[PDB]
Design a protein around this motif. Structure first.
Motif, PDB file in Angstrom:
ATOM      1  N   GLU C 111    -164.685   0.500 -30.092  1.00 39.80           N
ATOM      2  CA  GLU C 111    -163.994   1.325 -29.537  1.00 39.80           C
ATOM      3  C   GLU C 111    -163.519   2.341 -28.366  1.00 39.80           C
ATOM      4  O   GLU C 111    -164.493   2.341 -27.844  1.00 39.80           O
ATOM      5  CB  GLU C 111    -163.132   2.413 -30.903  1.00 39.80           C
ATOM      6  N   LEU C 112    -162.890   1.738 -28.250  1.00 37.56           N
ATOM      7  CA  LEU C 112    -162.644   3.016 -26.314  1.00 37.56           C
ATOM      8  C   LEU C 112    -162.349   4.749 -26.384  1.00 37.56           C
ATOM      9  O   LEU C 112    -162.013   4.508 -27.701  1.00 37.56           O
ATOM     10  CB  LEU C 112    -161.054   2.253 -25.577  1.00 37.56           C
ATOM     11  N   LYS C 113    -162.695   5.104 -25.388  1.00 34.41           N
ATOM     12  CA  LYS C 113    -162.965   6.694 -25.918  1.00 34.41           C
ATOM     13  C   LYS C 113    -161.942   7.234 -24.168  1.00 34.41           C
ATOM     14  O   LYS C 113    -161.233   6.124 -23.778  1.00 34.41           O
ATOM     15  CB  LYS C 113    -164.179   7.270 -25.599  1.00 34.41           C
ATOM     16  N   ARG C 114    -160.907   8.157 -24.376  1.00 36.31           N
ATOM     17  CA  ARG C 114    -160.292   8.285 -23.224  1.00 36.31           C
ATOM     18  C   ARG C 114    -159.651  10.345 -23.511  1.00 36.31           C
ATOM     19  O   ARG C 114    -160.430  10.897 -24.739  1.00 36.31           O
ATOM     20  CB  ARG C 114    -158.783   8.140 -24.055  1.00 36.31           C
ATOM     21  N   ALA C 115    -158.798  11.000 -22.714  1.00 33.33           N
ATOM     22  CA  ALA C 115    -158.828  11.866 -22.639  1.00 33.33           C
ATOM     23  C   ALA C 115    -157.551  12.226 -24.110  1.00 33.33           C
ATOM     24  O   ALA C 115    -157.155  11.422 -24.146  1.00 33.33           O
ATOM     25  CB  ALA C 115    -158.074  12.907 -21.402  1.00 33.33           C
ATOM     26  N   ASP C 116    -157.431  13.324 -24.476  1.00 29.82           N
ATOM     27  CA  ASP C 116    -157.192  13.383 -25.539  1.00 29.82           C
ATOM     28  C   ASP C 116    -155.488  13.565 -25.353  1.00 29.82           C
ATOM     29  O   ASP C 116    -155.231  14.332 -23.857  1.00 29.82           O
ATOM     30  CB  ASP C 116    -157.528  14.768 -26.080  1.00 29.82           C
ATOM     31  N   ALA C 117    -154.355  12.815 -25.805  1.00 26.52           N
ATOM     32  CA  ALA C 117    -152.926  13.047 -26.019  1.00 26.52           C
ATOM     33  C   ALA C 117    -152.579  13.334 -27.677  1.00 26.52           C
ATOM     34  O   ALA C 117    -152.531  12.492 -28.284  1.00 26.52           O
ATOM     35  CB  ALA C 117    -152.982  12.232 -25.279  1.00 26.52           C
ATOM     36  N   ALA C 118    -151.515  14.822 -27.015  1.00 31.03           N
ATOM     37  CA  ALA C 118    -150.836  14.802 -28.679  1.00 31.03           C
ATOM     38  C   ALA C 118    -149.928  13.417 -28.886  1.00 31.03           C
ATOM     39  O   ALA C 118    -148.926  12.920 -27.606  1.00 31.03           O
ATOM     40  CB  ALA C 118    -150.306  16.419 -28.356  1.00 31.03           C
ATOM     41  N   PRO C 119    -149.613  13.639 -30.299  1.00 31.58           N
ATOM     42  CA  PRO C 119    -148.051  12.700 -30.412  1.00 31.58           C
ATOM     43  C   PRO C 119    -146.766  12.984 -29.913  1.00 31.58           C
ATOM     44  O   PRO C 119    -146.564  14.351 -30.259  1.00 31.58           O
ATOM     45  CB  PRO C 119    -148.152  12.528 -31.752  1.00 31.58           C
ATOM     46  N   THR C 120    -146.076  11.806 -29.685  1.00 36.53           N
ATOM     47  CA  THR C 120    -144.579  11.804 -30.345  1.00 36.53           C
ATOM     48  C   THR C 120    -144.162  12.322 -31.497  1.00 36.53           C
ATOM     49  O   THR C 120    -143.568  10.699 -32.336  1.00 36.53           O
ATOM     50  CB  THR C 120    -143.795  11.317 -28.601  1.00 36.53           C
ATOM     51  N   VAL C 121    -143.191  13.201 -32.473  1.00 39.98           N
ATOM     52  CA  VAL C 121    -143.467  12.821 -33.515  1.00 39.98           C
ATOM     53  C   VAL C 121    -141.683  12.463 -33.973  1.00 39.98           C
ATOM     54  O   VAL C 121    -141.148  13.098 -33.024  1.00 39.98           O
ATOM     55  CB  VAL C 121    -143.415  14.215 -34.241  1.00 39.98           C
ATOM     56  N   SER C 122    -140.855  11.815 -34.271  1.00 39.22           N
ATOM     57  CA  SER C 122    -140.261  10.784 -34.988  1.00 39.22           C
ATOM     58  C   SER C 122    -139.619  11.140 -36.299  1.00 39.22           C
ATOM     59  O   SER C 122    -140.083  10.075 -37.085  1.00 39.22           O
ATOM     60  CB  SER C 122    -139.203  10.154 -34.310  1.00 39.22           C
ATOM     61  N   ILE C 123    -139.117  12.659 -37.043  1.00 38.32           N
ATOM     62  CA  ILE C 123    -138.465  12.145 -38.227  1.00 38.32           C
ATOM     63  C   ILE C 123    -137.188  11.421 -38.457  1.00 38.32           C
ATOM     64  O   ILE C 123    -136.684  11.369 -37.336  1.00 38.32           O
ATOM     65  CB  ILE C 123    -138.409  13.520 -38.660  1.00 38.32           C
ATOM     66  N   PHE C 124    -137.009  10.643 -39.319  1.00 39.90           N
ATOM     67  CA  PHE C 124    -136.196   9.952 -39.750  1.00 39.90           C
ATOM     68  C   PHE C 124    -135.549  10.040 -41.459  1.00 39.90           C
ATOM     69  O   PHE C 124    -136.068  10.065 -42.476  1.00 39.90           O
ATOM     70  CB  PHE C 124    -136.303   8.334 -39.542  1.00 39.90           C
ATOM     71  N   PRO C 125    -134.678  10.593 -41.388  1.00 35.82           N
ATOM     72  CA  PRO C 125    -133.690  10.808 -42.981  1.00 35.82           C
ATOM     73  C   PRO C 125    -134.080   9.391 -43.231  1.00 35.82           C
ATOM     74  O   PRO C 125    -133.692   7.833 -42.940  1.00 35.82           O
ATOM     75  CB  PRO C 125    -132.292  11.066 -42.850  1.00 35.82           C
ATOM     76  N   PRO C 126    -133.156   9.033 -45.037  1.00 34.42           N
ATOM     77  CA  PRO C 126    -133.218   7.630 -45.612  1.00 34.42           C
ATOM     78  C   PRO C 126    -131.878   7.518 -45.176  1.00 34.42           C
ATOM     79  O   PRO C 126    -131.109   8.023 -44.589  1.00 34.42           O
ATOM     80  CB  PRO C 126    -133.231   8.362 -47.378  1.00 34.42           C
ATOM     81  N   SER C 127    -131.580   6.002 -44.442  1.00 32.90           N
ATOM     82  CA  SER C 127    -130.964   5.544 -44.189  1.00 32.90           C
ATOM     83  C   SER C 127    -129.525   5.349 -45.340  1.00 32.90           C
ATOM     84  O   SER C 127    -129.990   5.900 -46.361  1.00 32.90           O
ATOM     85  CB  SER C 127    -130.916   3.501 -44.023  1.00 32.90           C
ATOM     86  N   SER C 128    -128.740   5.189 -45.248  1.00 32.43           N
ATOM     87  CA  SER C 128    -126.836   5.179 -45.389  1.00 32.43           C
ATOM     88  C   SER C 128    -127.695   3.977 -46.505  1.00 32.43           C
ATOM     89  O   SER C 128    -126.700   3.578 -48.035  1.00 32.43           O
ATOM     90  CB  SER C 128    -126.617   5.293 -45.624  1.00 32.43           C
ATOM     91  N   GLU C 129    -128.212   3.182 -46.484  1.00 33.02           N
ATOM     92  CA  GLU C 129    -127.786   1.384 -46.790  1.00 33.02           C
ATOM     93  C   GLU C 129    -129.219   1.167 -48.485  1.00 33.02           C
ATOM     94  O   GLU C 129    -128.884   0.830 -49.165  1.00 33.02           O
ATOM     95  CB  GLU C 129    -127.673   0.116 -45.714  1.00 33.02           C
ATOM     96  N   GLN C 130    -130.306   1.886 -47.976  1.00 29.08           N
ATOM     97  CA  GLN C 130    -131.095   2.389 -49.225  1.00 29.08           C
ATOM     98  C   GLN C 130    -130.273   3.345 -50.364  1.00 29.08           C
ATOM     99  O   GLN C 130    -130.508   3.110 -50.872  1.00 29.08           O
ATOM    100  CB  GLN C 130    -132.321   2.847 -48.133  1.00 29.08           C
ATOM    101  N   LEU C 131    -129.282   4.027 -49.985  1.00 32.81           N
ATOM    102  CA  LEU C 131    -129.288   5.401 -50.642  1.00 32.81           C
ATOM    103  C   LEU C 131    -128.081   4.742 -51.538  1.00 32.81           C
ATOM    104  O   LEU C 131    -128.372   5.363 -52.178  1.00 32.81           O
ATOM    105  CB  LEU C 131    -128.364   6.523 -49.813  1.00 32.81           C
ATOM    106  N   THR C 132    -127.605   3.780 -50.988  1.00 28.55           N
ATOM    107  CA  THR C 132    -126.829   2.698 -51.653  1.00 28.55           C
ATOM    108  C   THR C 132    -127.349   2.192 -53.318  1.00 28.55           C
ATOM    109  O   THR C 132    -127.002   1.913 -54.048  1.00 28.55           O
ATOM    110  CB  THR C 132    -126.386   2.109 -50.629  1.00 28.55           C
ATOM    111  N   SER C 133    -128.869   1.791 -52.562  1.00 28.51           N
ATOM    112  CA  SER C 133    -129.060   0.522 -54.296  1.00 28.51           C
ATOM    113  C   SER C 133    -130.503   1.974 -54.673  1.00 28.51           C
ATOM    114  O   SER C 133    -130.360   1.883 -55.947  1.00 28.51           O
ATOM    115  CB  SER C 133    -130.357  -0.094 -53.254  1.00 28.51           C
ATOM    116  N   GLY C 134    -130.106   3.054 -54.346  1.00 35.03           N
ATOM    117  CA  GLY C 134    -130.802   4.018 -55.276  1.00 35.03           C
ATOM    118  C   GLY C 134    -132.227   4.626 -54.942  1.00 35.03           C
ATOM    119  O   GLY C 134    -132.762   5.479 -55.785  1.00 35.03           O
ATOM    120  N   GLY C 135    -132.914   3.939 -53.749  1.00 36.17           N
ATOM    121  CA  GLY C 135    -134.492   5.215 -53.284  1.00 36.17           C
ATOM    122  C   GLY C 135    -133.881   5.593 -52.082  1.00 36.17           C
ATOM    123  O   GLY C 135    -132.866   4.970 -51.397  1.00 36.17           O
TER     124      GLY C 135
END
Lengths: 213, 213, 220, 214, 210
Positions: C111-135
């Motif tokens: 496993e490589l070691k490296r300097a610290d880098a913070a994450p790039t965060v992307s949140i996503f709502p549920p899709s319209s196609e999924q809501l249609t089916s009930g989940g």
């Protein structure tokens, strides 16, 4: 073929001596690890003594100084001399041989063994008693003998299908066993059914006709 | 010494199953561990040497593995003819030791006993003892309970019992049971009952005889 | 069987330093008549076959770069990597290549070691196609960060929520040595439709402040 | 199957008064071993000659000799220089066909060694042949025993007798490991035992070694 | 030299499966064929070996009541037949060739992944995930068995892309895949996650609307 035919089993008194033998054949006698292993009445196997092809002898601490294994190289006889016997020495004693050669710890060929009993009890012949009432069961009761064994047959083996001979059981220094045979009921008693009991320890052979009441 | 310990003490297998017997030693013994099978009324027979090296003439459904302190004998597709006792042996160093055996037992269809009862013979009555004998033959399973009744009052002093080892062809069990009295005792009662309780019925199998015949 | 003992099973180091792996055999792999030590070193990249590096303890396979080198003989063996790189993240496996049965070691994780880098965060709502089916699945990604240690939290209408959350880490990146993560808060369409604000808060070692990405269900 | 050794028939090292180094050397580091070669000549009916530099392989009979001439073969065994003739080095048997007989890894055969009937030790020998000569296996076996258990020493041997038994499936055969009595070992006479070119199948062979002490 | 294998095969517990390995480049009977097994995340185990010319096989005793190796000389294919499976046989099975004789396994197959279960084969629900860089997403949910291939514009652009390991829940796996592109591309450009499910012969082209 590899034969191992033990003899010399007997009843002996505590403190006495016995010589067991093993007439071997079908292999070069001097070339093999040959050992005695015994089976105790509780069904434990214990290694008792070994002799290497080359004459080296080995014993477990519990028999040393009392037991001696040896070979008659002229006659192919393996011997176990046993002195100062104890009750604990009572067992079926088996002669055994290695699989390939000079190695005394792998038992590839076994003799039928030879019963040794060490006990102060006195040899007693058995009383043999008939047990009579579309198949019928008859029996005989062999009671009050010592030591083991008795062998029981019916019409000299002519009957062997459907016999049951039960292990003897000891009581106040004597043994008792029972034996049962089934025969077609349209034959008996018109056709005779005899149980032959033998007890070599007391030179007994007896042929007891099973006669109806 | 090196103590060999076998597990479990008894196995109960269905024919066809792949089955496993274990042997742990107290010190390492490399692979100088041999396996033996003993069947009723027979000498032990070598199955496996050196933990895993097989032996000309042994069915290849027997195999072994392990090394050091832990060893395993595998029986692949068990046959009814495999009933008996199985032993491991330290062949590494002195004293050579045997494990205490593992008894293998076969499973089969339930079978009710065939029960006969026998009064004492006239010949016995003359000496001064009396034995009443009951045979319970060819049953399965071997859990079986036997009550003696004398004029309705169950007795259990003077009752000796004897089981045969599981049969190697039909996997059934047989037992005899013998009530020994004195001839006085015997002659002061009328009715003698041999009562057998077994899995196969909800109702005891009863066989008696009345002395007034 | 011959037992290969390999160690250590995990190795973090910075891109540039030398690295020492050891393989210890239980029996000897040395032969005399034609005398090479019959030990082979393998390199496995996640989700792909073992790739030959070294045979006969020291010989490099054609192609394989000279930075890798293998030394020792008999029952002790060394895999050395002069100045590690980003392409080198793998499990390294030693193999008894002498006698049947051929056997492998447990493997060493590089496993490589490296300097610290913070994450790039992307949140996503549920899709319209999924809501249609009930989940209804809300997905938060946390991408290209370092190190592995990362705690993500889910707020629904500001309120803490632990049940229903499934993570998945990738392996470290073959190119730029970062990691990446995803989180998935699953609810039923009903349960989703009855709250309005969904927040995904990433917490790290570099940031005394949490990294926050929210959305409103009825947003557009 | 060869039957086992009768009493006495096994050679005894205390009845050898010559120098045990004369036997030790046959099982020391040096030996003949060549891969994929073909015979270029033939001194007598029962032999073949190779350049590996000159090695004369002698079989027990013509059929063997004729069998492996004009065949590419592997050759492995114990050789000798003394009273050796091409009219350079000599040996018996040790030949196997090269093509179709090769494994890409080594098989291990376990050798079991016993002393006065007890278990002395076990070790493995290695061979990359499907079919291998008993000679090869013997030599791998004795060699290990010379390096590690002082089976042969310069002056004498601590063992009195010793034989080496080969069992494959259900047949078996054996070699006596000690020089015949007298005050002088003859290597060429001893090594003749391997001229039948006996072969065993490596996957199946078992080897056991039986030594007594004096 | 190529070693042609298959991606995966689903098998019922108790059943008996036969794996295959087609070769090209070298003449078959010149080299030995080895198989190795690997369970998820676990180490490597050697099954056996076969010599095409005479079908000489060397097994690992461990696998002798389980593995059979065979060959086809007419079409140069190497077979491994497993039989009577359990959960524990679940793993990837590689074929590989030897470099000649006393030489290492140089060329290897991609590996056939083997799943042992009675569960029903199911196709994936595929859902798009939309909100100077814009991160996007593809949610692939509720499938069985492993594995799935997820592509971006059917294999174009493959950097800045991430595909997360599947996770099981109640006999179905679920995974996600993200792609970050410069925000100058999306939506002026047409982004599409394609998903193939070899298990059920599926292929969906799910575009990523605003």
């Amino acid at each position: 073929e590899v034969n191992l035919i033990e003899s010399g089993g007997d009843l002996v008194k505590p403190g006495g001596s016995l010589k067991l033998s093993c007439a071997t054949s079908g292999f070069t006698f001097s070339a093999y690890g040959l050992s005695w292993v015994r089976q105790t009445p509780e069904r434990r196997l214990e290694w008792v003594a070994s002799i290497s092809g080359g004459g080296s002898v080995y014993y477990p601490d519990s028999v040393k100084g009392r037991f001696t294994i040896s070979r008659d190289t002229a006659g192919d006889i393996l011997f176990l001399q046993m002195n100062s016997l104890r009750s604990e020495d009572s067992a079926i004693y088996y002669c055994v041989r290695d699989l390939y050669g000079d190695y005394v710890g792998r038992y590839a060929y076994w003799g039928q063994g030879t019963l040794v009993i060490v006990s102060a009890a006195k040899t007693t012949p058995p009383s043999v008693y008939p047990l009579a009432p579309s198949m019928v069961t008859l029996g005989c009761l062999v009671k009050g003998y010592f030591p083991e064994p008795v062998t029981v047959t019916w019409n000299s083996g002519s009957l062997s299908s459907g016999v049951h001979t039960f292990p003897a059981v000891l009581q106040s220094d004597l043994y008792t066993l029972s034996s049962s045979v089934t025969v077609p009921s349209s034959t008996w008693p018109s056709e005779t059914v005899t149980c032959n009991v033998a007890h070599p320890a007391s030179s007994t052979k007896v042929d007891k006709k099973i006669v109806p009441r | 010494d090196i103590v060999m310990t076998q597990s479990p003490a008894t196995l109960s297998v269905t024919p066809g199953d792949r089955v496993s017997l274990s042997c742990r030693a107290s010190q390492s013994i490399g692979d100088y561990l041999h396996w033996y099978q003993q069947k009723s009324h027979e000498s032990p027979r070598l199955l496996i040497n050196y933990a895993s090296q097989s032996i000309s003439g042994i069915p290849s459904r027997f195999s072994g593995s392990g090394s050091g302190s832990d060893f395993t004998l595998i029986i692949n597709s068990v046959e009814p003819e495999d009933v008996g006792v199985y032993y491991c042996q330290n062949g590494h160093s002195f004293p050579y030791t045997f494990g205490g055996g593992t008894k293998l037992e076969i499973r089969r269809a339930d079978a009710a006993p065939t029960v006969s009862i026998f009064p004492p013979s006239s010949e016995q009555l003359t000496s001064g003892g009396a034995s009443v004998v009951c045979f319970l033959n060819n049953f399965y399973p071997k859990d079986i309970n036997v009550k003696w009744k004398i004029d309705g009052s169950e007795r259990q002093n003077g009752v000796l019992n004897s089981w045969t080892d599981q049969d190697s062809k039909d996997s059934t069990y047989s037992m005899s049971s013998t009530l020994t009295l004195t001839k006085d005792e015997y002659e002061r009662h009328n009715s003698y009952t041999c009562e057998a309780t077994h899995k196969t019925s909800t109702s005891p199998i009863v066989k008696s005889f009345n002395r007034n015949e | 069987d011959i037992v290969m003992t390999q160690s250590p099973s995990s190795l973090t180091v910075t891109a540039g330093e030398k690295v020492t792996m050891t393989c210890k055999s239980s029996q000897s792999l040395f032969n005399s008549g034609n005398q090479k030590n019959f030990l082979t070193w393998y390199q496995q990249i996640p989700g792909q076959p073992p790739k030959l590096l070294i045979y006969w303890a020291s010989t490099r396979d054609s192609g394989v770069p000279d930075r890798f080198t293998g030394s020792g003989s008999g029952t002790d063996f060394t895999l050395t990597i002069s100045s590690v790189q980003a392409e080198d993240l793998a499990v390294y496996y030693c193999q008894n290549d002498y006698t049947y049965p051929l056997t492998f070691g447990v493997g060493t994780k590089l496993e490589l070691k490296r300097a610290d880098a913070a994450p790039t965060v992307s949140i996503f709502p549920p899709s319209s196609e999924q809501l249609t089916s009930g989940g209804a699945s809300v997905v938060c990604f946390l991408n290209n960060f370092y190190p592995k240690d990362i705690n993500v939290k889910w707020k629904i209408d500001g309120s803490e929520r632990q049940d229903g959350v499934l993570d998945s880490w990738t392996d470290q990146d073959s190119k730029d040595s970062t990691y990446s993560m995803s989180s998935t808060l699953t609810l039923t369409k009903d349960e989703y439709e009855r709250h309005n604000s969904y927040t995904c808060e990433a917490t790290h070692k570099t940031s005394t402040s949490p990294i926050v990405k929210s959305f409103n269900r009825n947003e557009c | 199957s060869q039957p086992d050794p009768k009493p006495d028939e096994l050679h005894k090292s205390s009845k050898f008064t010559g120098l045990m180094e004369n036997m030790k050397v046959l099982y020391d580091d040096n030996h003949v071993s060549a891969i994929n070669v073909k015979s270029i000549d033939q001194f007598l009916y029962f032999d073949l000659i190779y350049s590996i530099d000159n090695v004369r392989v002698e079989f027990k009979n013509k059929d063997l000799a004729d069998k492996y001439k004009d065949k590419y073969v592997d050759v492995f065994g114990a050789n000798y220089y003394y009273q050796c003739y091409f009219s350079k080095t000599c040996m018996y048997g040790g030949v196997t066909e090269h093509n179709g007989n090769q494994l890409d890894k080594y098989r291990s055969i376990t050798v079991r060694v016993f002393e006065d009937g007890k278990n002395l030790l076990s070790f493995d020998v290695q061979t990359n042949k499907k079919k291998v000569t008993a000679q090869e296996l013997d030599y791998l076996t004795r060699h290990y025993l010379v390096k590690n258990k002082k089976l042969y020493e310069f002056n004498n041997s601590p063992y009195e007798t010793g034989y080496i038994k080969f069992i494959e499936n259900e047949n078996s055969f054996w070699y006596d490991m000690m020089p015949a009595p007298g005050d002088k070992f003859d290597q060429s006479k001893y090594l003749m035992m391997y001229n039948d070119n006996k072969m065993v199948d490596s996957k199946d062979v078992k080897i056991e070694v039986y030594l007594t002490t004096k | 030299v190529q070693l042609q294998q298959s991606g995966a095969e689903l098998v019922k517990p108790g059943a008996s499966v036969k794996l295959s390995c087609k070769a090209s480049g070298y003449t078959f009977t010149s080299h030995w064929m080895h198989w190795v097994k690997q369970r998820p995340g676990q180490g490597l185990e050697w099954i056996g070996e076969i010599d095409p010319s005479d079908s000489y096989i060397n097994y690992n005793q461990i696998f002798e009541g389980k593995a059979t190796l065979t060959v086809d000389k007419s079409s140069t294919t190497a077979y491994l037949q497993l039989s009577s499976l359990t959960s524990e046989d679940s793993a990837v099975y590689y074929c590989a060739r030897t470099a000649g004789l006393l030489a290492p396994m140089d060329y290897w197959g991609q590996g056939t992944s083997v799943t042992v279960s009675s569960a029903k084969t199911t196709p994936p629900s595929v859902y798009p995930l939309a909100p100077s860089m814009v991160t996007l997403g593809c949610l692939v949910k509720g499938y069985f068995p492993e594995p799935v291939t997820v592509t971006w514009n059917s294999g174009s652009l493959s950097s800045g892309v991430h595909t997360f390991p599947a996770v099981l829940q109640s006999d179905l796996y679920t995974l996600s895949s993200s792609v970050t592109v410069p925000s100058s591309t999306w939506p002026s450009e047409t982004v599409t996650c394609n998903v193939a499910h070899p298990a059920s012969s599926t292929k969906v082209d799910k575009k990523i609307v605003p």
